[PDB]
Design a binder for this molecule. Structure first.
Ligand SMILES: CS(=O)(=O)N(Cc1ccc(C(=O)NO)cc1)Cc1cccnc1
Ligand SMILES: [K+]
Ligand SMILES: [K+]
Ligand SMILES: [Zn+2]
Length: 357
């Protein structure tokens, strides 16, 4: 009945030296941590230390060239850093970025290890930079290494290769990197909910559509729930969990649940344009706690309204600690396009999941 929490101020050192107001701010993590203390949640958790991921651990998911390039940025001059960052889609780099990405990954490794050895039941990781857009061979969308994907593989490395890991990605953006890393893998089930807009929303790829179900042995093990034409919120997310996320997850029967918990679908986010409430995130967390004997690790991804992410992530930790879910508002009828989205995923995944028939 113990919840772990990892937070390390050193991850604030990654910064944008040319645009100091860039939304992926150092204070994202310190604000979430401060709100946990304000709400007296922090002292209810067992503190798990951060550590650096090793280069060998990074190789679980990333190419040696990509590791070596990001590693080399630690010693680069500002001119090198600016030009390297511009080689990627939506990346800024400072001399501290590599170490910060290592600490984000190693923090989650330590948290997964604590869960899998029975030291804690569940855990929350207040980490940056985020991970889910990072691919095998490249950085993207504020992410250098794929923390959640690396954690799944690390979990398998300390248990058995076939350990069933569910990754639920509720960041408003598609986790293109996580999908691609596990696209041919049946041991890691990837379920993403994301604003899609027929491919017009970042990261602007049809890879995020509902018809991408995985490849090879991973056919059926990639579930994309894409949202189009609507300011989605609690009713749509609750419905997707009831009809898709939870039935598929229960049938998969994961042994560990990782949440790529971005909070950019939250009410107030400057980029997501959605209205998931803090009580909504609490209910999503509480539902996931019914899987894998409660072995759930919540990993911060995106989310850019400092107040919204602080309240939202704190409510998730409150759920991990065993507090009762706060009451949702009256769930309005679903946006018509949300019903269309859910039906499209149901038709795409009915060949693979008997719980959907
Ligand atoms: C800051 S930006 O506007 O230039 N942006 C870059 C960006 C990359 C990744 C993430 C993230 O949270 N991923 O999970 C957020 C932003 C493009 C954009 C435009 C509209 C909506 N979303 C993204
Ligand atoms: K997502
Ligand atoms: K997969
Ligand atoms: Zn995001």
């Amino acid at each position: 009945p113990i919840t772990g929490l990892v937070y390390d101020q050193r991850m604030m050192l990654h910064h944008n030296m040319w645009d100091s107001h860039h939304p992926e701010l150092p204070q994202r993590i310190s604000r979430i941590f401060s709100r946990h203390e304000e709400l007296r949640l922090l002292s209810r958790c067992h503190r798990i230390p951060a550590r650096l991921a090793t280069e060998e651990e990074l190789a679980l998911c990333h190419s040696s060239k990509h590791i070596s390039i990001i590693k080399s940025s630690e010693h680069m001059k500002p001119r090198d850093l600016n030009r390297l960052g511009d080689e990627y889609n939506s990346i800024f780099i400072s001399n501290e970025s590599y170490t910060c990405a290592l600490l984000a990954a190693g923090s989650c490794f330590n948290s997964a290890q604590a869960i899998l050895t029975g030291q804690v039941r569940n855990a929350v990781a207040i980490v940056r930079p985020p991970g889910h857009h990072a691919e095998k061979d490249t950085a993207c969308g504020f992410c250098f290494f794929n923390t959640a994907a690396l954690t799944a593989r690390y979990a398998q490395s300390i248990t058995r290769e076939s350990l069933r890991v569910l990754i639920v990605d509720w960041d408003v953006h598609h986790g293109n990197g996580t999908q691609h890393i596990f696209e041919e893998d049946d041991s890691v089930l990837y379920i993403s909910l994301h604003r899609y807009e027929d491919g017009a929303f970042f990261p602007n790829s049809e890879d995020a559509n509902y018809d991408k179900v995985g490849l090879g042995k991973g056919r059926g093990y990639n579930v994309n729930i894409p949202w189009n034409g609507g300011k989605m919120g609690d009713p749509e997310y609750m419905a997707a969990f009831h009809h898709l996320v939870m039935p598929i997850a229960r049938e998969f029967a994961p042994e560990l649940v990782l949440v790529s918990a971005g909070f950019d679908a939250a009410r107030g986010d400057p980029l997501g344009g959605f209205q998931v409430t803090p009580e909504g995130y609490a209910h999503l967390t509480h539902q996931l706690m019914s899987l894998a004997a409660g072995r759930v690790l919540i990993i911060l991804e995106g989310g850019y309204n400092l107040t919204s992410i602080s309240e939202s992530m704190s409510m998730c930790t409150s759920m991990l600690l065993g507090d009762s879910p706060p009451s949702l508002d009256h769930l309005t009828p679903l946006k018509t396009s949300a019903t269309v989205s859910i039906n499209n995923v149901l038709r795409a995944h009915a060949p693979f999941w008997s719980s959907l028939r």
